[PDB]
Chain length 115, copies 4
């Protein structure tokens, strides 16, 4: 699994479950092409977005739909979504875990990159 | 000042100086229209982006060029940029960002 | 002002006002000696803790009473307090803390 | 496993490996008694600190030795250690994951509490 995303809720001290996210890849013409999407599980994780063959070098954007998450819980948050934009696989295949920790007016995101 | 941005460096324990950013406003067709831009000062702050009359309700995106900042310090970072996307709602916005090479956080303080 | 503390609330998007804190200095026997204390202002800041002459090199601990802050807002938090423990080194310190009920971050900006 | 700690390095985009930590429990006389200790693995995790029987209600302090970690890498960081202080098990047994994300002048910590 070359790209995985983990999302945590800093208000409840829990995984952020059923969080939707859309991944885009920058095309040759500089537009964002849809690449993969899904929603987090009960553990706050999203696995299986892509495969090593399909996840070629490029610039990727993970848009995590945090507003929808907080609204579904009756909280009115600040951000529309959390956006994570990065070059992937530019020195060969790597495995990426993107983590995001969510509060209504703040988030943090980190990446762990392994070879 | 309706909109201010402050950027800090978590590796050096310092303001993040000369960080470029662009602000965009979402247009009716869902594209991003340039709105304002600038570079942070010696105190890590960028003031004067817009005025109360111009800063109407809408979706805005602040794109902080973190990759250039880390590159000028000779450090390889993860992200291309940091993005802060939000609705401005009439019901002062300070956007803060704390940068590390493989992580960042952002918060908003909305005050009177 | 050699030492300033700023505390923000990540749930409300606001300064964290009336947050109490105590500062301690590590003594030669490894106990913590009271050094300074106060409560954050309307802007989430606590100024005036110490002076340059008193703030000598040493290990200090800032204990931020986050549990009382969340309790007064009617919210159950995780931590008893946030602790920031550091060496002051002569080779201005701003300690920031961003609070959520089950998380916090802290950073130091050390400037001239 | 009722108490686990995960530590990440925000400069390298990696788990924080071989990070030492000491856990204390507040005694009846208000002193901190040593409770458990260990160091993170190659995945940045520390498992097996305690058992459900021994991990009774109380106030616990996890002191993560971040300065030693950064020094061992030739970085001079700001903090002595990261301290996580919390009441545990006060409405019955729970399982706690403490996470910490480390930079030389900043850290974040979060807790996930499950039942
Ligand atoms: C693939 C590997 C060795 C670690 C990747 C990884 C993980 O497998 C679990 C994780 O859980 C976490 C749980 C938390 O409560 C937490 O705060 C983090 C840190 C992420 C932040 C502060 C955005 C992480 C975190 O980054 C994290 C994380 O980076
Ligand atoms: C002395 C100087 C050049 C900056 C010190 C300073 C400050 O004067 C105001 C600040 O407001 C902030 C407002 C925020 O919403 C915010 O998230 C931060 C970042 C600190 C964290 C995430 C613990 C800061 C922050 O670090 C900060 C900060 O470090
Ligand atoms: Br979408
Ligand atoms: Br599931
Ligand atoms: Br949007
Ligand atoms: Br891009
Ligand atoms: Br921030
Ligand atoms: Br602020
Ligand atoms: Br305590
Ligand atoms: Br120790
Ligand atoms: Br191991
Ligand atoms: Br110490
Ligand atoms: Br964390
Ligand atoms: Br977790």
């Amino acid at each position: 699994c070359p790209l995985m995303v983990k999302v945590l809720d800093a208000v409840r001290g829990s995984p952020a479950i059923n969080v939707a996210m859309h991944v885009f890849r920058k095309a040759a013409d500089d537009t964002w092409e849809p690449f993969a999407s899904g929603k987090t599980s009960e553990s706050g994780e999203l696995h299986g977005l892509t495969t090593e063959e399909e996840f070629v070098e490029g610039i990727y954007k993970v848009e995590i739909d945090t507003k929808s998450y907080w609204k579904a819980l009756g909280i009115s948050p600040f951000h529309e979504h959390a956006e994570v934009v990065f070059t992937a696989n530019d020195s060969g295949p790597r495995r990426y875990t993107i983590a995001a920790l969510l509060s209504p007016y703040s988030y943090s995101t980190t990446a762990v990159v392994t070879n």
